[model samples]
Target: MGIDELYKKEFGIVAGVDEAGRGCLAGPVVAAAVVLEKEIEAKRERLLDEIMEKAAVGIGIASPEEIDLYNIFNATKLAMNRALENLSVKPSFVLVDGKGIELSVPGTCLVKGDQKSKLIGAASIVAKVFRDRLMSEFHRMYPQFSFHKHKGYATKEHLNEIRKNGVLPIHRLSFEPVLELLTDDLLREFFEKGLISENRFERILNLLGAR
Candidate 1:
């Protein structure tokens, strides 16, 4: 059987899954699940070819705010779940590109499948382009962070910004440097003063270690 026939015979519906931003010090990991219909195989190929012509893909995205609220793993799972749920047609089996999925759908993990399988590669392209657009928007809000260039990945410039400005709301508070900095009484005092609801004397006491 040809590759297309193999895809058709082995599974009723095949979904490709991949993730983005897993290693970032900030932001949420994003995962995408793309289920392609067998009948649309030629159409899918044509779409892929059109997208590649511009070195881009058209795909949906999960927001950073979603990531911040749920944390990375849960956020990624939610994204994948949403992707599948949004599809007009349901998939029979899912081909996830990694180990260990906690999704509701029946799925199999394939390590490095993005490199080996065209479906996974297409998913990778979709997720990557979607996440890049998100990081670009983040860069607009926080210009000093340069998220557009690095996409929130840890780099020398990113660390330098964190060290210089302390931490922003988008930063993961659980991370080491941000966690340590959060305990600095002086910084806390400065932060509290900026808020409207702060009681001046109590804030001072907290800053001075008197209570």
Candidate 2:
């Protein structure tokens, strides 16, 4: 039996939840909730628009500032809650992709719910495509960083860019290496370790007005 089918047997209504870009070094983390949909092929990318048309969907975002202030875990739950609240009809039960999510409605937290529940999988696709669209827009504004390519993941290229140009407003300063890159005390260590050149260190210090 399918996961949603099994849940629907007991529950009057079910909503599946998932988020995207939680691990990204920059940009917002986006969560999506889906009610009443089979798994749509995410390979097409454009199919997400069709899913939005066909399904009852809700989206929420936790920005880099929120992630830094509240931490990823709490921010993720906050995003999830917003998504659920934004839905047209409240769910009788929520199927969540990760642990520690507190829902006003009754819910189950599956460690990898997307793999087990087609509804969660659909939510996952919606979250990813929506976040990617946002990142692509960021690319147009920044142009210095390839937000469109890596979607703000801490790839080597992204690291190099940050080392060269310094962190942008959208960067999660609390994230590792990003923290090391911008924190005033770590400037010397980063320079000594050659993680950042002396000139770049000075530039970063100047960027922070620490000098």
Q: What is the TM-score of each candidate against the true structure?
A: 0.70, 0.82
Name the lDDT value of residue 113 in candidate 1.
73
Segments in model 1 whose C-alpha atoms lie over 4 Å from true places:
1-7, 37-71, 184-211
User: How does candidate 2 fare on TM-score?
Assistant: 0.82
Clashing pairs in 1: none
| The best candidate in terms of TM-score | 2
Tens-place lDDT digits, model 2, residues 1-211: 2677788778878999999999999988999999975455446377677677678998988887677677889888888988998899888899999886877678999888888887888889999988999999999999999999999999999999999988765787667678677757666666677755455556556655632
Error of 2 at 174 (Å): 0.9
C-alpha-based local distance difference test score of model 2: 0.82
Q: On residues 56-165, what C-alpha lDDT tens digit does candidate 1 reach at each position?
A: 22233455445544555777777777766765556776667777766667867777877766566667766676677788998899888888988887788888888886
**Candidate 1 backbone clash number:** 0
Candidate 1, after superposition: displacement of residue 186 in Å?
9.7
